Amino acid sequence: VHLSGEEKSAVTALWGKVNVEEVGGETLGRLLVVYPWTQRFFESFGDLSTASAVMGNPKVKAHGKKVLAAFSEGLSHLDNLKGTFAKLSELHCDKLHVDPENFRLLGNVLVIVLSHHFGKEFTPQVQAAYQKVVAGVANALAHKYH
Amino acid sequence: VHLSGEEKSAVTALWGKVNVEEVGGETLGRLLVVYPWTQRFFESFGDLSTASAVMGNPKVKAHGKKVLAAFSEGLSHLDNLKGTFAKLSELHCDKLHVDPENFRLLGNVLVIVLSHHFGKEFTPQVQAAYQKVVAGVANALAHKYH
Amino acid sequence: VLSPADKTNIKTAWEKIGSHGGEYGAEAVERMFLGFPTTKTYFPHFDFTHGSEQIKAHGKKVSEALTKAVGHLDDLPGALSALSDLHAHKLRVDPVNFKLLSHCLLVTLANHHPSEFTPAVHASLDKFLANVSTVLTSKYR
Amino acid sequence: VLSPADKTNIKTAWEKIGSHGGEYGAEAVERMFLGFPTTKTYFPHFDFTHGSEQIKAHGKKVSEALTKAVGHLDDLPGALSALSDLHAHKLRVDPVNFKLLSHCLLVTLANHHPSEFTPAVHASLDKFLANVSTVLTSKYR
Numbered sequence: 369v370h371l372s373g374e375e376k377s378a379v380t381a382l383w384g385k386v387n388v389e390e391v392g393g394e395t396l397g398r399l400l401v402v403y404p405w406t407q408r409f410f411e412s413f414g415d416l417s418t419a420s421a422v423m424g425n426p427k428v429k430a431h432g433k434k435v436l437a438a439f440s441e442g443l444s445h446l447d448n449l450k451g452t453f454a455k456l457s458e459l460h461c462d463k464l465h466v467d468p469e470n471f472r473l474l475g476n477v478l479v480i481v482l483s484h485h486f487g488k489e490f491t492p493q494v495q496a497a498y499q500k501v502v503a504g505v506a507n508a509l510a511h512k513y514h
Numbered sequence: 515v516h517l518s519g520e521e522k523s524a525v526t527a528l529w530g531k532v533n534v535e536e537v538g539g540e541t542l543g544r545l546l547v548v549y550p551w552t553q554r555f556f557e558s559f560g561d562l563s564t565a566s567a568v569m570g571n572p573k574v575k576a577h578g579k580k581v582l583a584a585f586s587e588g589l590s591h592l593d594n595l596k597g598t599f600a601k602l603s604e605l606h607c608d609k610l611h612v613d614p615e616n617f618r619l620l621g622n623v624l625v626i627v628l629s630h631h632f633g634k635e636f637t638p639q640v641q642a643a644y645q646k647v648v649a650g651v652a653n654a655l656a657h658k659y660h
Numbered sequence: 661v662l663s664p665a666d667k668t669n670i671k672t673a674w675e676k677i678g679s680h681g682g683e684y685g686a687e688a689v690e691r692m693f694l695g696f697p698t699t700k701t702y703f704p705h706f707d708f709t710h711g712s713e714q715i716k717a718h719g720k721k722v723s724e725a726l727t728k729a730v731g732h733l734d735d736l737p738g739a740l741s742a743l744s745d746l747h748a749h750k751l752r753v754d755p756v757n758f759k760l761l762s763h764c765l766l767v768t769l770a771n772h773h774p775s776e777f778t779p780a781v782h783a784s785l786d787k788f789l790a791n792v793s794t795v796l797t798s799k800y801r
Numbered sequence: 802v803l804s805p806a807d808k809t810n811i812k813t814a815w816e817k818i819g820s821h822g823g824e825y826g827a828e829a830v831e832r833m834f835l836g837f838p839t840t841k842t843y844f845p846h847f848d849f850t851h852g853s854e855q856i857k858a859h860g861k862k863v864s865e866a867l868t869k870a871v872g873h874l875d876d877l878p879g880a881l882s883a884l885s886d887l888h889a890h891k892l893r894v895d896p897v898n899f900k901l902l903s904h905c906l907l908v909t910l911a912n913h914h915p916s917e918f919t920p921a922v923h924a925s926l927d928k929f930l931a932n933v934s935t936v937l938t939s940k941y942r
């Protein structure tokens with residue numbers, strides 16, 4: 369993605385303070401809770417039928433971190449997100465058969481989560497930034513249908 | 515994109531029967547009617563408040579011819595759709611801010627219109643070969659953001 | 661949201677559908693399977709060859725499911741709660757797949773009813789399918 | 802489509818807005834224009850500057866609108882008919898812009914009301930905003 373000196377500094381600085389154990393967990397749950405059809409891809413995870421179950425669920429918390437690290441790796445490799453996620457893009461889109469739309473919903477569920485967490489610090493200027501990062505990760509994770 | 519030989523036959527062959535004078539404008543019209551917000555980008559063209567008015571609009575007919583031409587060009591340079599379409603992609607995305615989603619709705623309407631014109635000749639298998647073609651084109655036109 | 665104009669347009673088209681229901685539903689189901697191969701993963705237990713009585717039995721079913729929503733254009737949520745239980749709660753189908761079948765239903769109606777398939781009727785039919793999708797994919801019970 | 806619970810969750814949440822709603826109106830709108838600057842296109846006759854009084858007044862209007870909406874959740878097309886006629890009939894707004902502003906209302910609510918911003922409320926408010934959204938972009942009169 370394209371980021372100005374300042375926005376680049378914010379995206380990182382902030383990302384530095386992120387609780388790595390909570391966020392991707394909280395996020396994936398929020399994705400599961402809000403967009404309920406996304407639960408089809410996570411049935412082997414146990415009970416997802418309710419708000420609490422989504423956020424009580426251990427495997428949800430576990431897989432949630434698996435996504436957080438992939439965002440961080442991405443966050444270092446913004447200059448080459450297509451390469452970074454090329455294997456991962458094939459997994460979702462030749463083998464797991466996920467619609468690229470959700471990739472987009474999930475970045476946005478993440479941005480909320482970050483607001484929910486950082487407060488006044490997640491400024492519109494900082495969000496402005498992430499909405500650019502998250503668009504990219506999505507674009508990046510989707511280039512196997514080409 | 516990547517069509518087989520059998521598909522490439524079927525695509526070319528049907529496309530040569532197309533009424534190049536009538537089909538693009540049919541589309542943009544059904545596009546414009548079925549999805550009214552798409553009228554915002556075409557305010558210059560006059561009263562676009564109804565199906566009739568939308569269908570009798572010479573600026574819509576005149577425009578379609580060009581829409582359909584951009585498509586035809588596609589079908590000759592199928593495995594280089596980026597190159598071919600970058601100039602239009604730079605146009606639509608940057609100076610027009612026409613959201614990607616709208617590229618897909620056009621390709622689809624183009625498919626309906628083909629169905630409408632050709633009946634049973636437009637077989638399920640020809641619907642597939644084309645659904646490949648419209649995506650690609652719409653993906654390429656999206657491609658300036660990315 | 662369905663305009664009074666839309667409701668009129670819809671009923672008229674289905675008046676013209678007649679007993680030709682299930683074949684279009686089948687053709688449609690066929691258009692979506694070949695046109696969008698991922699939507700077949702939703703059917704691991706179905707036969708898929710062009711013949712496919714199973715397709716036709718499901719096409720006939722999907723069609724009348726449609727026909728039913730037509731007679732209840734003023735409250736579909738209560739009307740199709742049953743199919744919601746299937747699609748929203750049990751199968752958890754990704755709404756995009758409704759946009760696909762939806763579009764493929766129009767690909768067909770346009771194909772066999774050219775004269776009926778005007779620009780104006782297409783809008784109403786497209787919004788109709790869209791409202792059928794929302795109900796089927798929303799959970800409200 | 803809203804469940805009985807969505808309706809509980811929305812009213813319930815919205816009571817917990819005090820008279821602060823209009824300050825959330827301004828901020829989210831700001832998160833919009835700054836996060837997705839193609840959205841400004843719809844406001845070329847407006848003050849934007851950090852702190853605009855025009856943005857101050859417009860968010861008050863937008864929040865009050867959702868107040869009226871929370872006032873009538875079983876009959877949103879009726880209760881919002883005028884904003885439809887403005888957004889859908891005259892302005893002809895691309896529904897993507899509504900998803901962008903909804904998301905931006907979600908991001909703001911989560912900023913100031915974490916303890917309130919439960920996953921269950923997050924899901925009901927989203928459905929409330931897609932509904933509102935569906936209404937103002939639809940031409941139904």
Ligand code: HEM
Nearest residue numbers: 406409410434435438439456464466470471472474506509
């Ligand atoms: C767009 C952001 C996303 C990122 C960064 C991401 C990342 C990942 C990663 C790193 C894995 C681990 C695979 C491995 O190396 O073993 C994974 C697996 C998986 N992803 Fe995603 N993903 C994203 C979106 C999605 C979406 C939207 C869905 C569908 C709702 C999805 C469904 C899955 C499933 C079902 C698995 C396998 C879990 C298992 O082991 O059974 N992902 N993802």
Ligand code: HEM
Nearest residue numbers: 552555556580581584585602606610612616617620621655
């Ligand atoms: C299916 C993909 C599309 C194709 C192949 C296409 C094709 C074209 C072509 C050939 C031109 C003429 C410019 C030139 O080459 O001199 C054009 C311009 C334009 N396009 Fe598209 N178009 C597509 C989709 C869309 C969509 C969805 C919209 C918005 C709803 C849009 C909005 C416009 C506008 C507003 C213009 C110029 C209007 C004017 O003449 O002042 N296009 N497009």
Ligand code: HEM
Nearest residue numbers: 699702703721722725726743746751753757758761762792
């Ligand atoms: C126009 C929209 C649709 C309508 C009106 C509709 C209607 C129906 C009907 C009437 C049934 C028969 C259920 C029964 O008798 O118990 C059914 C089942 C089913 N539907 Fe749909 N459906 C629609 C869209 C979809 C889509 C887009 C998908 C996914 C690609 C889907 C997946 C299924 C599946 C997997 C079944 C169960 C089939 C079986 O095992 O017998 N439906 N639907």
Ligand code: HEM
Nearest residue numbers: 840843844862863866867884888892894898899902933934
């Ligand atoms: C939650 C969804 C929305 C709500 C509740 C809402 C509400 C309102 C209200 C209450 C007004 C002024 C009422 C009046 O003057 O009679 C208004 C005007 C307006 N809206 Fe929205 N709106 C929404 C979404 C959008 C979006 C996505 C856009 C496009 C980015 C947009 C563009 C406009 C414009 C240009 C005006 C006129 C402002 C003026 O000139 O005074 N609205 N809206």
